[PDB]
């Protein structure tokens, strides 16, 4: 709905994605580059955000599968109050974009840190 | 229906092209498989040196910066400005 109560969740949601684009380094995109070593990629050999289908499927609705009734779970399984929360809404939003508005991973100096 | 050949199966199973000397693919990343890079490894160097460069992909080009130093020689030119030193 609902309201109100879809802010905690958005809180843990975007913290991660805006962890993705914090604690990275990065390496691809690419673009620029190159776009698409390890295998090579490994990583299949091309085009595999679908279990992202099944995993983003996996989670949202075993999260709310839930809901403390949880069913999912199940049986068994062996085979102001917007004000604080909605300006902490905001300075999350932000430091995407300064995170992002310039490369982070500077690494200009200064000095140096490794090396 | 054919008794005779099935129109000919080194022509029809000439997928024997799944397999051949297809190293057309295959051996196009086993000779990058040994690639560079001065080359190889030191002296010129693992980065940075690189950020930046041969590799990537990309884009690009490239050159860039003389090749070098003109200048940068101490300063350039030269023998060496001059220009004054």
């Known amino acids: 709905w609902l309201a109100y109560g879809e802010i905690i969740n958005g809180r843990f949601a975007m913290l991660g994605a805006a962890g993705a684009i914090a604690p990275e380094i990065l390496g691809k995109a690419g673009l620029i580059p190159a776009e698409t070593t390890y295998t090579y990629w490994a990583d299949n050999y091309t085009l595999f955000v679908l279990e992202m289908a099944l995993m983003g499927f996996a989670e949202h609705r075993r999260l709310q599968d839930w809901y403390n009734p949880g069913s999912m779970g199940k049986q068994y399984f062996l085979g102001k109050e917007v004000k604080n929360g909605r300006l902490a809404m905001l300075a999350i939003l932000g430091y995407f974009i300064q995170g992002l508005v310039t490369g982070v991973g500077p690494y200009q100096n200064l000095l140096d840190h490794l090396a | ?85």
């Open chain 2, 1 to 85: 229906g054919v008794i005779e050949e099935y129109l000919e199966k080194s022509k029809t199973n000439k997928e024997l092209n799944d397999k051949k000397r297809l190293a057309t693919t295959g051996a196009n990343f086993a000779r990058a498989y040994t690639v560079e890079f001065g080359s190889c490894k030191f002296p010129e160097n693992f980065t940075g040196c690189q950020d930046l460069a041969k590799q990537k992909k990309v884009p690009f080009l490239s050159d860039d910066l003389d090749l070098e130093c003109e200048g940068k020689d101490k300063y350039k030119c030269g023998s060496n400005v001059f220009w004054k030193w």
